[PDB]
Structure formats: C-alpha cells, structure tokens
Design a binder for this molecule. Sequence first.
Ligand code: HEM
Ligand code: HEM
Ligand code: HEM
Ligand code: HEM
Ligand code: HEM
Ligand code: HEM
Lengths: 71, 71, 71, 71, 71, 71
Amino acid sequence: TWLPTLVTATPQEGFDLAVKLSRIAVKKTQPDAQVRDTLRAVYEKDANALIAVSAVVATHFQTIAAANDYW
Amino acid sequence: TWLPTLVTATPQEGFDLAVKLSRIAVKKTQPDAQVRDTLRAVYEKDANALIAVSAVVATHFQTIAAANDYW
Amino acid sequence: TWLPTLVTATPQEGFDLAVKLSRIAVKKTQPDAQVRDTLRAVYEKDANALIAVSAVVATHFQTIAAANDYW
Amino acid sequence: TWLPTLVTATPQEGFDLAVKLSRIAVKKTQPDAQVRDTLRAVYEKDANALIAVSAVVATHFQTIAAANDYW
Amino acid sequence: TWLPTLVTATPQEGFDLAVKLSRIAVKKTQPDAQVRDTLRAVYEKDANALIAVSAVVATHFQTIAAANDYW
Amino acid sequence: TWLPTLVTATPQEGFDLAVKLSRIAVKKTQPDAQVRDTLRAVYEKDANALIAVSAVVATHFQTIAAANDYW
Ligand code: HEM
Ligand code: HEM
Ligand code: HEM
Ligand code: HEM
Ligand code: HEM
Ligand code: HEM
C-alpha cells in the first residue's frame, strides 16, 4: 500500500506527491536499484533530462491538483 | 477482452492500470514479442527512455484518475 | 466517412479507436503508402519511437474516454 | 479571418480542423513558404517526426472535441 | 501588465494569444535578445523544432479555449 | 512552505507561478545549485531546450489557470 490516496493537505504536499508518482513509474519499470543509481549519475547532470523530468511531474501535478479541487 | 473497465478500487490500482495501458499500446503496434525483448534491453538502461516512459503513464493515470472521480 | 463518432461500446474499443486516431494523422500527412512502409521497418524496432507512439495514443485515449464518460 | 469557430459538424471535421490548427502554428512562426517546402522534404520521411506530428494534432483534437461536446 | 486576461474575442485571437504565451516563457528564461536572435536563425529552419513549437502553442490554445468556453 | 496556494490574482501572476512551479521540480531533483549553474549555461543557449522549457510551463499554466477558474 504505497498509493493510498491523491488527497493532499496542502498544494505543496501535492507537488511532492507528484514527484513521487513520477519516480514510482520508474522504479516499477526498472526495479534493479543498482542500475537506477548508475542512470542517476547520468541524468542528474543532463539539462534536457531535467527539463523532461519537470514535464512528467507537471502532468502528475495536474492530476493531483484536480484531485484536491485545487486546494 | 483485456480492457474491461477504467473503474479501479484504489489509486494504487489506478497507477498499475495506467502502466498496463501504457504497455498495451507498444504491444499492439509491435506484436513480435521477440524484438520487444531486444528493445527492453536498450530502454531499461536508458535514462531519457525511462522518463519518457513515466510521462506516458502520467498521461494515462490522468485519464483513469478522472474516470474514478479521483478516489 | 472514416470518423463517424468517438462513442465506443467498450473501453477496449476506445483504445483501438485511439490507436486508429493516431495512425490517421500519419496517413494524412504522408499518404504515400510506399514511404509509410519504409518508415515502419525503421520505427517498429526503435524503443524511443515505440514509447513515443504510446504517448500519442495516450493523448487520444484521454479524448475518447471522456467522449464515453469513461464507459 | 482563418479560425472562425471551433464548432464542427462531425468528429471527422474535428480531426481535419485539429490538423489545420497544428499547421497554422508552423505557418505563423515560419512564414517563408519556401523553407517550409525544404523541411517538408525532411520530416515527411522522418518517423519520429511523423509521430511527433500526430501528437500535436492529438492535443488539438482534444481541445476541439471538448469544444463540440464530443459529438 | 503584459497578461491582463485570457478572455479573447474570437477563437482566432486565442491562437495568437497562445503563440504569445509560448514566446513569453522563452523571453523570460532568456531575456538576452541578442541570443534569442541567434537561436531563431537556428530553429526557424529545424523541422523538429517547428513541430515542437506547434506542440507548445497546442497546450496553450487548450488553456485559452477553455478560458473562453470555446467561443 | 514554498507552495502555499494555486490561487493567483491575475493571469500574469498565474504565468509567473507556472514558471516557478516548473523550476522547483528541477530544484528538488537536482539540489546541487552549483551543477544547476553549469547546465543553465548549456540550455539557456539551446533552442530545443527553450521550447521544451516553454512546454513544461504550458502544462503548469494549464493547471493553475483551471485553479483560478480562468480569471
Ligand atoms: C502515431 C503513432 C502510431 C501508432 C499508434 C501506430 C500503430 C500501429 C499499429 C497498432 C499497427 C499494427 C501492427 C500489427 O498488428 O502488426 C501499425 C502498423 C503499421 N504502421 Fe504504425 N503506428 C503509428 C505511427 C506510424 C508511422 C509514423 C508510420 C510511418 C509513416 C507507420 C506505419 C505503419 C505501417 C506501414 C504498418 C503496417 C506494418 C506491417 O506491414 O506489419 N505507423 N501501426
Ligand atoms: C509505455 C511505456 C512503458 C511502460 C510504462 C513499461 C513498463 C514496464 C514494466 C512495469 C515492466 C515490468 C518490469 C519488471 O517487473 O522487472 C516492463 C517490462 C518489459 N517491457 Fe516495458 N514499458 C514500456 C515500454 C516498453 C517498450 C517500448 C518495450 C519494447 C518494445 C517494452 C518491453 C518490455 C519487455 C520485453 C519487458 C519484460 C522485461 C523482462 O523480461 O524483465 N516496454 N515494462
Ligand atoms: C515557444 C515556442 C515558440 C513559438 C510559438 C514562437 C513563435 C514565433 C512567431 C509566431 C514568430 C513571428 C515570425 C514572423 O512573423 O516572422 C517568432 C519570431 C521569433 N522568434 Fe519564436 N517562437 C517560439 C520559440 C522561440 C525561441 C525558443 C526563440 C529563441 C530564444 C525564439 C526567437 C524568435 C525570434 C528572435 C523571432 C523574430 C525573428 C525575426 O527576426 O523574424 N522563438 N516566433
Ligand atoms: C503540426 C504538425 C504538422 C501537421 C499535422 C502537418 C500536416 C500536413 C498535412 C496533412 C499535409 C498534406 C499532405 C498531402 O496532402 O500530401 C502537409 C503538407 C505539408 N507540410 Fe505539414 N504538417 C505539420 C508540420 C509541418 C512543418 C513543421 C512543416 C515545415 C515547415 C510543414 C510543411 C509542409 C509543406 C510545405 C506541405 C505541402 C507538401 C507537399 O507539397 O506535398 N508541415 N502537412
Ligand atoms: C520520472 C521523473 C523523475 C523525477 C521527478 C525524479 C525525481 C527525483 C528526486 C526529487 C530525487 C531526490 C534528489 C535529492 O533530494 O537528492 C531523485 C533522486 C534519485 N533519482 Fe530521480 N527522478 C526521476 C527519474 C529518475 C530515473 C529515470 C532514475 C533512474 C532509473 C532515477 C534515479 C534516481 C536515483 C538513484 C536518486 C537518488 C540519487 C542520490 O543518491 O542522491 N530518477 N529523483
Ligand atoms: C522547467 C523548465 C525551466 C524553466 C521554466 C526555467 C526558467 C527560468 C527563468 C525564468 C530564469 C530567470 C532568468 C533571468 O532572469 O535571466 C531561470 C534561470 C536559471 N535557471 Fe531555469 N528554468 C527551467 C529549467 C532549468 C534547468 C533544467 C536548470 C538546470 C539545472 C535551470 C537552472 C537555472 C539557473 C542556474 C538560473 C539562474 C541563471 C542566471 O544566473 O542568470 N533551469 N530559469
């Protein structure tokens, strides 16, 4: 039971839930934590990757903001 | 009959379905399970590929979440 | 008369309609079926392309799910 | 006056308008019809370009479809 | 006071507002007009860039169409 | 407490918040402000990077605009 609800007390908590939702898709499709570390070293310093990341969390934040009727 | 409903009990199973839906699209377009195996070996270790992947499911989760009235 | 309605009997039929809607954009912008075959040989085996494909059908499935009030 | 309304009789004409809308954006940004011809020759034979293209129209179709109350 | 409202008299005016909204994000993140000119010379003739542009304005047009209850 | 509310007085401040939200995502993922400086130097002069950037904020603006009932 990792995703109980989308209901979030503050908009802030929603954005962290949004970052969370983004990473869990990743952890599911690549559960090998050893390779998840090796790729981190790569994208953490890649501009386009980091923009692309914000893109994902943007989509999710849209879903959870609506879940909270925009707090 | 693989996609009976968008209704899901919890957000967790909303996210799992979102993931499945993401996958069935590639399965329909590229049915040769063998080549699917070849490319798995390429994207599972790609950073940009994994973030892209997270995005697709983020769009899908957005649909089902709405379909469940956000739990 | 290729696109009569977005109304779909089952969620499943909506996803196939979504895959359809994705390909018709392609067929319109590149009606030369000869080059559509040559490009198929290329993207059918490209991981990023295949993710990108799921992305498109994801957007469309969002539109048709809503059209069916999520079945 | 090129974009009078988003109202469209059928979904088919919804998709055609979606396509047009996609195109008018590139036409506005790059008005030199000649170079537009040069690049046409490059993307019409690009796979990733065609899928990208399908995506833009998928976003647009999403807007008008909503504007037509989904027919 | 550059962005007073999203309310637009005609759908057409909404698309121009959408193109506007797209460029202002750019002007904010890169206010040096000298480098904005140098990059223009580059993307104005890049197919994928020009598709990518239409993608942005597509998202925005979705937001402003809704703002106008689709005119 | 950095994200107190999505409510914004004007669309202008809607767009500014949208931009901020876009940035906080990269700040959370990559907190080492120093490397953030290094990559700034790379994307601020990239065309595809700037359009990508505009897209993220276009998604975000879509969320808050909805949260403000479009002003
Ligand atoms: C917009 C995203 C796209 C989606 C969702 C999509 C989906 C599909 C699907 C589901 C099939 C059937 C595969 C099978 O059952 O064997 C297919 C086949 C095919 N697609 Fe795509 N496609 C997309 C883009 C493209 C593009 C850009 C091209 C090239 C211009 C293309 C060319 C083809 C061709 C030629 C086939 C028939 C392949 C064969 O002979 O087996 N498609 N596509
Ligand atoms: C829409 C984006 C995609 C998502 C969300 C996704 C998700 C997943 C997940 C959750 C798994 C299970 C991983 C595990 O339990 O270790 C998986 C495995 C797999 N995927 Fe993807 N995938 C995507 C795209 C693709 C593509 C483009 C391909 C290649 C054609 C592909 C081929 C495979 C294969 C063959 C496996 C089984 C791998 C193994 O043997 O461990 N997937 N995927
Ligand atoms: C966000 C997506 C963008 C859109 C929708 C967009 C749209 C437009 C449009 C419609 C024009 C007017 C073209 C004309 O009438 O001649 C234009 C011009 C221009 N754009 Fe973009 N643009 C985008 C991104 C960018 C970026 C990333 C840059 C570089 C930082 C840029 C720099 C310029 C410049 C310098 C001009 C004036 C070009 C000239 O001197 O004719 N734009 N853009
Ligand atoms: C937003 C994504 C786009 C869509 C949906 C789109 C769609 C289309 C369609 C449906 C056609 C008619 C094809 C035919 O009847 O054979 C076409 C042709 C054309 N497009 Fe695109 N296009 C897009 C982007 C672009 C871009 C970026 C350029 C280059 C600046 C471009 C330049 C052209 C030109 C010059 C033609 C006429 C080609 C010919 O002479 O056959 N389009 N496009
Ligand atoms: C889906 C988009 C993603 C988002 C929003 C995201 C976000 C984050 C955030 C906020 C952190 C914490 C950073 C810190 O506080 O130091 C983090 C760390 C990390 N991420 Fe990502 N991430 C994404 C994709 C990925 C991918 C694709 C991978 C590789 C498979 C990955 C691997 C890691 C690892 C290993 C860490 C821990 C790094 C460390 O040891 O400091 N993430 N991520
Ligand atoms: C989500 C997309 C992004 C948006 C909307 C965005 C927006 C902005 C804006 C509006 C500024 C102020 C520019 C000025 O006043 O001259 C800025 C500056 C800056 N950005 Fe971004 N940014 C994005 C992504 C990133 C990324 C990926 C990085 C690198 C990790 C980054 C690092 C920086 C840094 C270090 C500055 C300060 C630059 C300076 O000293 O002038 N941003 N950004």
